[PDB]
Design a protein around this ligand. Sequence first.
Ligand SMILES: Nc1ncnc2c1ncn2[C@@H]1O[C@H](COP(=O)(O)OP(=O)(O)OC[C@H]2O[C@H](O)[C@H](O)[C@@H]2O)[C@@H](O)[C@H]1O
Ligand SMILES: NS(=O)(=O)c1cccc(S(=O)(=O)N2CCN(Cc3ccc(-c4ccccc4F)s3)CC2)c1
Ligand SMILES: [Cl-]
Ligand SMILES: [Cl-]
Ligand SMILES: [Cl-]
Ligand SMILES: [Zn+2]
Length: 282
Amino acid sequence: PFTADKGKCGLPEIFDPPEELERKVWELARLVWQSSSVVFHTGAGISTASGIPDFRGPHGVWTMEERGLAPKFDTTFESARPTQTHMALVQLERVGLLRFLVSQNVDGLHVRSGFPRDKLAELHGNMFVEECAKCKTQYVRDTVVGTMGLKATGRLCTVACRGELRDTILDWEDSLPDRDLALADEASRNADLSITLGTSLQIRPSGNLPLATKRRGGRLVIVNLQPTKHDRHADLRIHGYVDEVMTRLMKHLGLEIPAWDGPRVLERALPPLPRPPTPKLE
Ligand SMILES: Nc1ncnc2c1ncn2[C@@H]1O[C@H](COP(=O)(O)OP(=O)(O)OC[C@H]2O[C@H](O)[C@H](O)[C@@H]2O)[C@@H](O)[C@H]1O
Ligand SMILES: NS(=O)(=O)c1cccc(S(=O)(=O)N2CCN(Cc3ccc(-c4ccccc4F)s3)CC2)c1
Ligand SMILES: [Cl-]
Ligand SMILES: [Cl-]
Ligand SMILES: [Cl-]
Ligand SMILES: [Zn+2]
């Protein structure tokens, strides 16, 4: 825990020049249009533009720790707003262009954005979510559950049970929630496109799930400012801010990024909305 391997921290950032970046976002649009089953994989890099530091970026939590400095938050977890990237992912789900969403983020922003929980794997937990040790019933709270490491929060279950409520935040030694990992793995294996956004892909098994898409000739896109463990395996690497990438992608797909209503929980994916017709590609 003190000696936990925190991987490669503070690698230099890469920036694709504008013409190369424009061309790669067009090729990402082409891959989205051609794919039957698209799975997105998100890490800490998609929440940096809302004031939450990443882990291994230049000013990441682990990077700063390694250099004897402190990470900086420009928000509380409760005051954090979903990024343009978060809200793009909401819309891509609503119009049927995203099949499943796998996140290593504990910041609760996917849930609070209104993204449907039945199409989301939270592989490392959710700091707003406590779970009954007895009945396994989950509670999505409006404030952060004040513990980490799957500890008693002090609250009891209110299901018609008085079980011990615990946080869902994995410690270094804790294996992943079985249901979330099973769904994430099935979604990744059956995908013909996996797109990774703001993750360095260094954590097993989370960072390995996008490689499962490469089985049976699936395509892998990696969007990230730094190198990632799997750059070698990517059909397309995009070195740019994820909000710039996703806003230009939505524009190519003819989709608007929806307004955020404030924190809202949606358990189940609503029926698919109309989407624009597909361009002639070939
Ligand atoms: N706006 C941005 N646009 C694009 N890339 C970005 C942006 N901001 C940051 N990045 C990149 O985003 C990447 C974020 O990589 P890491 O910091 O390793 O986060 P993880 O989610 O993969 O960490 C996995 C677990 O490890 C921890 O112990 C926790 O348990 C985590 O759940 C970097 O490479 C940045 O270059
Ligand atoms: N990604 S994010 O936007 O939700 C984010 C970004 C920065 C800081 C936070 S945090 O303040 O809520 N916090 C900082 C300390 N972490 C300790 C860990 C304990 C165990 C860990 C672990 C579990 C399983 C596999 C591998 C692992 F490394 S990581 C927990 C999150 C959240
Ligand atoms: Cl907070
Ligand atoms: Cl909808
Ligand atoms: Cl912890
Ligand atoms: Zn209970």
